[PDB]
Design a protein around this ligand. Structure first.
Ligand SMILES: COC1=C(OC)C(=O)C(C/C=C(\C)CC/C=C(/C)CC/C=C(/C)CC/C=C(/C)CC/C=C(/C)CC/C=C(/C)CC/C=C(/C)CC/C=C(/C)CC/C=C(\C)CCC=C(C)C)=C(C)C1=O
Ligand SMILES: CCCCCCCCCCCCCCCCCC(=O)OC[C@H](COP(=O)([O-])OCC[N+](C)(C)C)OC(=O)CCCCCCCCCCCCCCCCC
Ligand SMILES: CCCCCCCCCCCCCCCCCC(=O)OC[C@H](COP(=O)([O-])OCC[N+](C)(C)C)OC(=O)CCCCCCCCCCCCCCCCC
Ligand SMILES: CCCCCCCCCCCCCCCCCC(=O)OC[C@H](COP(=O)([O-])OCC[N+](C)(C)C)OC(=O)CCCCCCCCCCCCCCCCC
Ligand SMILES: CCCCCCCCCCCCCCCCCC(=O)OC[C@H](COP(=O)([O-])OCC[N+](C)(C)C)OC(=O)CCCCCCCCCCCCCCCCC
Ligand SMILES: CCCCCCCCCCCCCCCCCC(=O)OC[C@H](COP(=O)(O)OCCN)OC(=O)CCCCCCCCCCCCCCCCC
Ligand SMILES: CCCCCCCCCCCCCCCCCC(=O)OC[C@H](COP(=O)(O)OCCN)OC(=O)CCCCCCCCCCCCCCCCC
Ligand SMILES: CCCCCCCCCCCCCCCCCC(=O)OC[C@H](COP(=O)(O)OCCN)OC(=O)CCCCCCCCCCCCCCCCC
Ligand SMILES: NC(=O)C1=CN([C@@H]2O[C@H](COP(=O)(O)OP(=O)(O)OC[C@H]3O[C@@H](n4cnc5c(N)ncnc54)[C@H](OP(=O)(O)O)[C@@H]3O)[C@@H](O)[C@H]2O)C=CC1
Ligand SMILES: CCCCCCCCCCCC(=O)OC[C@H](COP(=O)(O)OCC[N+](C)(C)C)OC(=O)CCCCCCCCCCC
Ligand SMILES: CCCCCCCCCCCC(=O)OC[C@H](COP(=O)(O)OCC[N+](C)(C)C)OC(=O)CCCCCCCCCCC
Ligand code: SF4
Ligand code: SF4
Ligand code: SF4
Ligand SMILES: [Zn+2]
Lengths: 96, 48, 155, 209, 176, 342, 146, 115
């Protein structure tokens, strides 16, 4: 999420911000600091975990050829959910 | 768009902004990476 | 009131300058081809009042359309200097903006802004004839917001 | 030659060029050092630097050559060779609808005779070679820089000349003119090591050192 | 096969000589040139009323760059650096690190729009349709610095033009 | 700052000098040279301007991308002063007018504005402050310009005790109003000089020398709290100087004396101009004010600058004042003017 | 993997003690002037130097020459080595004379008071290779380390 | 081995003649150059610069290298006489905008890492 540093400058999704003594803050005087307010780390975390019945599931990102290369995710571990290395969607095997 | 509207996404801007160059809303480039080398901070108490 | 009058006089000279822009006949590389198409019938820059004239002494705008090399850089500064004021520079294309495809060449100037001041930067390689025309109409709006006389009135 | 993706061979032209390569080497043994024909049917004659005027004159005037057009003339810089420069002449024959390549060599200090007497087209190609490589052509009608800026020092197309050079230009308001200063780059050119550590073409494997 | 363009012998009969005499003295072939420009004066001009009308474009148009997201809001870019390796102008600078959730993501994604040659090689090489050239071309600026796009500026462009960008990829991805 | 900006590079356009400088009055004669030198070595320059942005265009090519930053400011608005100095390490005040307007007078320009800048600079945490006074600034001066210079000089020395005060002589250069001023008197036929210009002594200093002294005062820690007098290497009578200006410009020199009171009446006549006045009463007083000799103050030689003689650079300034017949005349064609022995 | 330690706790500016007794940043001119003032005021045994573990030969000789300009010979190291007998007069006294590649030719190796697995990981790997391929006989006098 | 094709001069004695001939051409040209280009330098500064350029290569003993230097020098002279060069090209020999870089070890030490 977008949060402001004590001096008031916004912090980007990469965690970048200028210190209170950094002369480079002069570039924002009379202008604005461009910051994207839709942090991708928050939005992916809002997606529900998909329940599946097989030990191995495939993700192409949705949209077929408009997604990402099809990869196969192993769901044998019960402690954690299998995560797509491309798009971050999580899958869990039904009742292990 | 009135006959075939665009797909709806919750991250698409609801309000369109025209070219903002020359105004206070213009874009100012900056580096989006954090500092790389951390300097040593001397102790704040005299050794003596 | 005096502030009202200088405001209206400012609106008059600003109008006259943005409605009668005369670019210098000056093109360097491929970007000048796209500048020709802005004079071609489809876009017809002449209908906005924009007329090319070859003499730098009768030009109001310099469009740096193409690559600027070290050999040509003294020539560019000379023709820019020989332009009576007020004079505006429009930088067209990646080469004239920051070197473009030839940024790392021994013989290329990394941006025309190292040689002359630049008022509008038009991106592209080349910018379409309609993208250069956007920069010209963006230059006209810049001239429309000048406050030469108002700033004089309160000196 | 029925394979869709492979380039078909023209073995009729390969024999003809090989036959004519021997023909030239038989007539000019004083200068011809090596003849070869590539797999895409391009004949190359490699000569001693002294044979530039005799070889090209024969190839332009002999009734069985008639190479009346100088397609191009250029140099290649190979630092590892004792003679680092390789002068390449690409000739075209309109009479016989054929092409031939004549190659010689030189170094930083050895001149090569100018071929303007043989081909008027070589006037500017030799200026470009001198300007971009520093190879001097003797008896050239007027030899000087053609592409580089006035007063430019060095030869850009040498392999040891840096890509961005040594100097760059800006405008200085104190002296009211364009000045030249040592090159500083806001972003350094990023060198990519693209070569794969696995051999690609066994046919060209050089004998082990 | 060849043809001659200017190998013709004029007739020498008295009627042909007089015809050429009338052309010389009465400027007939110059009057004919006037008639061609008079015809254009009465044709409709080809000018369009910009900016109220726009020149036609196609879904393949290569305009301003943008970074896209998946429908869930996650960034498509996974810091592979194929765009950086193929960019002919070296206009792309990328840095990456594991994100707080362990995802392969970028911390720097800069495009110097003054080095870029708007060739589209980056969107060809992207295996996840992350970096695209959008349909926008009206983004001139009053200063040089505004053309040095960073990651925040590129994500804002993607979020602004996604509605149009998605429809153009839908119209052209079968040709790719 | 304990760990200030660390310099990097070889002192070029893309290097970092570690100098973040706010230059008030950068859009004038002395400003363009200072900004050029700062930006020539890779320095962050903030340029607050009161003029139209079109009037700041010649400063843009003076620095790499993002190194020259422009802001609006008002001399009577402390908030706008604080915006433009709150991030800087050095502040250079080059604000001045040679004439009084309807809105600003010598007191407002040379006393109130410098004090406000210094006061805000101290509160903002700036460490180095460079202030440009005049050599002939004394409280007992007939020139109201030179009286305000004296008052402003002491106000700055109190508000910013560690400030560096520079007192130049009449600076000359391409855009100066000193040699151009004399060469432009040809429009009126003859040159009127009080006492025929033989009772006044001038010690003009070259613009680049003043600029390099200002830059060297930023880098030298020994200039904190000092007051420097920047003067040229040679002293001239007003007559011999003006005679030299007309000799280099190759134009007829027809001087005549004019009483002081009459010369002030001429100055009053030309003050009515609602634009940049050609001359004023104050300009006549400064022109005929003998340049002070202040051996107790450090000068250019201390900061490390070799003062450039007026004879090596007058042609660079005065060549454009020649006609076509004399444009090509070389530098070694006018013998140097008589110099008052040291 | 220890290279990442080169990005933390780095000394980047000269420092000196101020009135309060705290280290504060200063210029190179100021720092070398203080050290030069004291070095001029002392000589002989009053000046000594200690060299750490990561110091290079070029710096070692420059400091030795500098301290010899004040007639000092107290150039020490943190690592002890006996000076009894030949001391450091003969190189063979303080070297691995068989060479790392010579372990492959030895047939008996005696390790005295050393845990080579951690003191020299690559030297220990060389011993294991000789152990595996040359049937080396290894004996150790010291703590029974793995 | 050691037998090479010459360019213009067969020995240093012959080569030095071409050096002197070139020097006399440059020496006579400076007054014209300082006049046509309207340089703000003196004829003495220009002729000092020519001398500085010649003494920069006084250690050469290979006649061929000397021949190329004269060849390059004559190209420079031709560019200046015909005014192919501009005022900017003729003033690049004086480096007026380059701040004097340090020469002694201490000054180089303070500013950076370069030798
Ligand atoms: C392909 O390879 C390449 C080239 O190869 C071609 C190149 O070339 C180049 C180099 C390129 C360039 C230098 C730029 C090229 C760009 C172009 C647009 C050229 C292409 C072709 C054209 C035909 C463009 C325009 C030229 C013409 C001839 C069009 C004719 C129409 C016009 C409107 C021109 C002028 C005409 C008229 C009738 C006069 C208008 C002029 C005025 C000044 C306006 C009126 C004048 C006044 C003085 C004001 C009026 C009122 C007054 C004076 C006051 C009266 C009232 C009172 C009260 C006093 C490159 C790089 C290249 O790669
Ligand atoms: C013969 C020479 C005579 C010289 C004497 C002075 C003559 C002045 C009369 C001519 C006035 C110019 C025409 C008015 C401007 C205009 O029509 O543009 C409309 C413009 C049009 O707007 P626009 O310029 O933004 O249009 C953009 C293009 N479109 C619309 C197609 C997208 O609108 C304006 O009002 C802009 C400000 C105009 C300022 C005019 C102030 C005049 C006040 C008189 C001052 C005293 C006069 C002496
Ligand atoms: C055929 C037609 C022929 C007649 C054409 C008549 C044109 C009608 C326009 C009338 C308005 C003219 C004003 C433009 C003056 C030029 C200008 O912009 O100078 C700005 C100048 C700028 O001065 P400044 O003080 O702001 O700054 C100058 C210093 N530098 C260069 C560093 C910026 O301002 C003025 O001179 C004030 C103008 C006063 C109003 C005009 C008075 C005369 C005309 C009306 C009576
Ligand atoms: C029966 C009794 C015996 C006597 C009877 C005689 C009756 C006939 C009288 C002679 C008729 C002569 C007609 C005039 C000829 C003059 C022209 C000429 O010399 O031609 C040769 C000239 C030159 O022709 P040439 O270039 O081919 O060379 C001729 C000579 N040789 C071939 C040997 C080299 O033609 C021109 O003048 C070219 C015109 C220049 C372009 C002008 C633009 C065209 C404009 C067209 C519109 C004109 C509108 C005019 C009306 C305006 C109304 C106000
Ligand atoms: C605007 C309102 C609309 C009407 C405006 C008038 C338009 C007139 C110009 C267009 C004419 C049409 C073009 C045409 O047919 O020309 C081809 C024709 C034929 O072109 P041709 O060159 O092929 O000649 C054919 C016949 N021979 C070769 C034998 C000569 O040209 C003419 O016949 C024009 C002859 C007229 C000569 C007038 C010159 C003397 C003028 C005296 C003063 C008046
Ligand atoms: C019929 C039209 C009457 C109305 C025209 C009014 C305009 C007059 C101006 C134009 C000149 C046309 C008048 C000249 C006679 C034309 C008729 C004619 O010549 O007879 C036709 C006959 C057929 O020609 P043919 O045999 O095919 O080849 C020529 C071989 N001598 O040709 C001949 O063989 C006869 C001999 C031809 C040579 C005679 C000399 C002709 C050239 C003299 C200059 C004529 C123009 C003088 C007036 C100039 C002013 C306009
Ligand atoms: C009665 C006797 C009066 C005696 C003379 C009094 C002294 C007057 C001196 C006039 C000085 C004018 C001047 O300094 O120049 C003003 C003006 C602009 O100066 P310029 O050199 O052209 O270029 C400057 C670019 N920034 O340059 C000019 O406009 C030239 C002056 C025009 C005079 C017209 C009359
Ligand atoms: C209290 C004093 C005031 C009294 C009231 C005055 C009222 C106005 C009087 C107007 C009439 C004055 C006539 C001119 C006065 C004489 C000017 C003069 O003599 O100076 C010129 C001077 C002559 O040379 P000189 O100085 O003697 O020798 C050394 C030079 N390095 O230097 C020269 O060599 C230059 C020669 C110039 C010749 C033209 C003289 C000026 C022409 C008249 C002005 C128009
Ligand atoms: N002959 C000389 O040059 C001398 C110079 N000095 C002093 O050096 C300083 C620099 O002057 P100089 O460069 O030579 O000549 P300039 O008059 O050209 O410089 C004046 C600068 O100060 C600004 N200025 C003037 N009044 C105001 C105001 N009310 N508010 C805001 N800015 C103002 C101007 O901005 P803007 O243009 O937008 O109004 C301009 O940038 C002056 O203080 C001068 O007294 C001392 C000795 C000799
Ligand atoms: C042939 C002889 C020529 C004479 C000179 C003519 C040019 C100068 C005149 C200026 C007079 C003056 O004073 O106007 C100025 C006054 C206010 O003065 P201020 O603010 O005290 O100025 C003090 C100096 N500042 C301003 C630098 C601080 O503004 C006005 O109310 C109107 C100003 C605009 C001019 C109005 C005329 C409109 C004409 C329209 C034509 C189409
Ligand atoms: C009494 C009186 O009419 O004077 C008029 C007043 C006097 O100005 P002031 O009050 O002395 O101060 C003025 C300066 N200030 C306020 C900055 C200190 O000027 C004006 O309004 C402007 C009138 C300008 C006259 C233009 C004539 C130009 C002719 C051109 C010849 C080449
Ligand atoms: S920016 Fe593109 S189109 Fe324009 S000159 Fe450069 S390469 Fe050609
Ligand atoms: S469009 Fe081409 S030049 Fe521009 S960033 Fe992409 S790959 Fe690089
Ligand atoms: S934009 Fe695409 S090609 Fe470029 S780094 Fe990201 S995923 Fe790879
Ligand atoms: Zn996925």
């Amino acid at each position: 999420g977008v949060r402001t540093s004590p001096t008031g400058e916004k912090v980007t999704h990469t965690g970048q911000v200028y210190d209170d003594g950094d002369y480079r803050k002069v570039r924002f005087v009379g202008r604005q600091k461009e910051v994207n307010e839709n942090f991708a780390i928050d939005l992916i975390a809002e997606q529900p975990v998909s329940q599946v019945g097989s030990r191995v599931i495939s993700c192409d990102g949705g949209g077929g050829a408009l997604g990402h290369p099809r990869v196969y995710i192993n769901l044998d571990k019960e402690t954690k959910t299998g995560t797509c290395g491309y798009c971050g969607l999580q899958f869990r095997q039904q009742h292990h | 768009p009135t006959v075939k509207p665009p797909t709806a996404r919750k991250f698409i801007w609801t309000n369109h902004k025209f070219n903002l160059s020359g105004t206070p809303q213009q874009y100012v480039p900056y580096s989006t990476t954090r500092k790389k080398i951390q300097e040593w901070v001397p102790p704040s108490t005299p050794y003596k | 009131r005096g502030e009202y009058v200088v405001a209206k006089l400012d609106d008059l000279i600003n109008w006259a300058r943005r409605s009668s822009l005369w670019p210098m006949t000056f093109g360097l590389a491929c970007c000048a081809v796209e500048m020709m198409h802005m004079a071609a019938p489809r876009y017809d820059m002449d209908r906005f009042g924009v007329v090319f004239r070859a003499s730098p002494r009768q030009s109001d705008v310099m469009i740096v359309a193409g690559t600027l090399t070290n050999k040509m850089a003294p020539a560019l500064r000379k023709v820019y200097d020989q332009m009576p004021e007020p004079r505006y520079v429009v930088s067209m294309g990646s080469c004239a903006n920051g070197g473009g495809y030839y940024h790392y060449s021994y013989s290329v100037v990394r941006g025309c802004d190292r040689i002359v001041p630049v008022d509008i930067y038009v991106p592209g390689c080349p910018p379409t004839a309609e993208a250069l025309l956007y920069g010209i109409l963006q230059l006209q709006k810049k001239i429309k917001r000048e406050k030469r006389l108002r700033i004089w009135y309160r000196r | 030659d029925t394979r869709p993706t492979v380039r078909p061979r023209n073995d009729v032209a390969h024999k003809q060029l090989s036959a004519f390569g021997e023909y030239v080497a038989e007539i000019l043994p004083k200068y011809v050092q090596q003849v070869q024909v590539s797999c895409f049917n391009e004949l190359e004659i490699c000569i001693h630097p002294d044979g530039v005027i005799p070889v090209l004159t024969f190839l332009r005037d002999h009734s069985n050559a008639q190479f009346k057009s100088l397609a191009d003339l250029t140099a290649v810089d190979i630092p590892t060779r004792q003679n680092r420069f390789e002068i390449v002449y690409n000739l075209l024959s309109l009479r016989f609808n054929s092409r031939i390549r004549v190659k010689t060599y030189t170094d930083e200090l050895t001149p090569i005779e100018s071929s303007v007497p043989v081909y008027k087209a070589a006037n500017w190609y030799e200026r470009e070679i001198w300007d971009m490589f520093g190879v001097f052509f003797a008896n050239h009608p007027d030899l000087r820089r053609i592409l580089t800026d006035y007063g430019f020092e060095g030869h850009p197309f040498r392999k040891d000349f840096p890509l961005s050079g040594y100097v760059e230009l800006r405008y200085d308001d104190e002296v009211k003119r364009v000045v030249a200063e040592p090159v500083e780059l806001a972003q350094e050119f990023r060198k990519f090591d693209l070569n794969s550590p696995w051999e690609a073409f066994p046919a060209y494997r050089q004998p082990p050192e | 096969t060849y043809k001659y363009v200017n190998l013709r012998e004029p007739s020498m009969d008295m009627k042909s000589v007089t015809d050429r005499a009338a052309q010389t003295l009465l400027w007939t072939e110059l009057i004919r040139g006037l008639g061609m420009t008079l015809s254009y004066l009465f044709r409709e001009p080809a000018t369009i009323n910009y900016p109220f009308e726009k020149g036609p474009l196609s879904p393949r148009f290569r305009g301003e760059h943008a970074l896209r997201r998946y429908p869930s809001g996650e960034e498509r870019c996974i810091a592979c650096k194929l765009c950086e390796a193929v960019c002919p102008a070296q206009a792309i600078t990328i840095e990456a690190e594991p994100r707080a959730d362990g995802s392969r993501r970028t911390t720097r994604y800069d495009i110097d729009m003054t080095k870029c040659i708007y060739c589209g090689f980056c969107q060809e090489a992207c295996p996840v349709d992350a970096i695209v050239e959008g349909p926008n071309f009206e983004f001139s600026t009053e200063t040089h610095e505004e053309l040095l796009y960073n990651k925040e500026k590129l994500l804002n462009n993607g979020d602004k033009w996604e509605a149009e960008i998605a429809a153009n990829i839908q119209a052209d991805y079968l040709y790719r | 700052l304990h760990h200030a900006v660390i310099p990097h590079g070889k002192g070029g356009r893309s290097s970092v000098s570690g100098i973040v400088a706010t230059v008030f009055g950068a859009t004038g004669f002395l400003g363009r040279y200072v900004v050029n030198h700062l930006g020539r070595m890779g320095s962050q320059v903030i340029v607050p301007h009161r003029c139209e942005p079109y009037d700041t265009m010649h400063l843009r090519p003076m620095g790499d991308l993002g190194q020259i930053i422009f802001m609006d400011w008002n001399g009577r608005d402390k908030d706008s002063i604080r915006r433009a100095v709150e991030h800087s390490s050095v502040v250079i005040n080059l604000v001045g007018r040679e004439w009084e307007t309807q809105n600003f007078d010598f007191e407002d320009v040379f006393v109130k504005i410098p004090q406000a800048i210094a006061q805000v600079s101290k509160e903002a945490g700036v460490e180095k402050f460079i202030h440009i006074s005049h050599l002939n600034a004394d409280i007992k001066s007939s020139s109201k310009y030179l009286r305000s210079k004296a008052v402003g000089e002491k106000e700055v020395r109190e508000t910013f005790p560690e400030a560096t005060i520079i007192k130049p002589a009449e600076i000359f250069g391409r855009e100066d109003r000193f040699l151009n001023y004399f060469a432009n008197i040809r429009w009126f036929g003859g040159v009127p000089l009080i006492s025929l210009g033989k009772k006044t002594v001038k010690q003009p200093v070259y613009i680049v020398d003043v600029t390099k002294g200002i830059i060297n005062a930023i880098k030298d820690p020994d200039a904190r709290g000092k007051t420097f007098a920047f003067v040229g290497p040679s002293r001239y009578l007003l007559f011999d100087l003006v005679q030299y200006v007309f000799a280099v410009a190759h134009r007829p020199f027809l001087p005549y004396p004019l009483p002081h009171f009459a010369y002030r009446w001429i100055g009053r006549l030309f003050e009515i101009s609602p634009f940049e006045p050609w001359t004023t009463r104050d300009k006549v007083e400064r022109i005929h004010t003998t340049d002070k000799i202040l051996p107790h103050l450090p000068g250019l030689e201390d900061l490390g600058v070799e003062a450039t003689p007026l004879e090596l650079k007058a042609i660079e300034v005065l060549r454009r004042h020649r006609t076509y017949r004399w444009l090509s005349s070389e530098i070694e064609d006018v013998q140097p003017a008589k110099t008052i022995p040291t | 993997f220890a290279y990442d330690g080169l990005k933390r706790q780095r000394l980047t500016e000269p420092m000196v003690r101020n009135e309060k007794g705290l280290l504060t940043h200063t210029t190179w001119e100021d720092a070398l002037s203080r050290v030069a003032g004291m070095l001029q005021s002392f000589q002989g045994n009053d000046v000594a130097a200690i060299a750490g573990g990561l110091v290079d030969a070029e710096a070692l000789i420059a400091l030795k020459d500098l301290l010899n300009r004040v007639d000092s010979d107290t150039l020490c190291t943190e690592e002890v080595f006996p000076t009894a007998g030949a001391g450091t007069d003969l190189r063979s006294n303080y070297l691995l004379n068989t060479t790392i590649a010579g372990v492959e030719e030895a047939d008996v190796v005696l390790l005295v008071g050393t845990n080579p697995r951690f003191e020299a990981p690559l030297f220990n790997a060389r011993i294991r290779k000789s152990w595996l391929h040359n049937d080396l006989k290894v004996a150790l006098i010291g703590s029974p380390v793995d | 081995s050691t037998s090479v094709k010459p360019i213009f001069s067969r020995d240093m004695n012959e080569a030095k003649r071409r050096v002197r001939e070139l020097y006399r051409a440059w020496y006579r040209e400076v007054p014209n150059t300082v006049h046509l280009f309207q340089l703000d330098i003196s004829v003495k500064q220009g002729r000092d610069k020519v001398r500085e350029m010649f003494k920069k290569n006084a250690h050469i003993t290979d006649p061929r290298v000397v021949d190329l230097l004269v060849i390059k020098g004559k190209m420079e002279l031709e560019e200046t006489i015909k005014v192919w060069k501009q005022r900017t090209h003729v003033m690049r020999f004086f480096h007026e905008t380059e701040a004097p870089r340090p020469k002694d070890f201490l000054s180089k030490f303070y500013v950076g890492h370069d030798p």
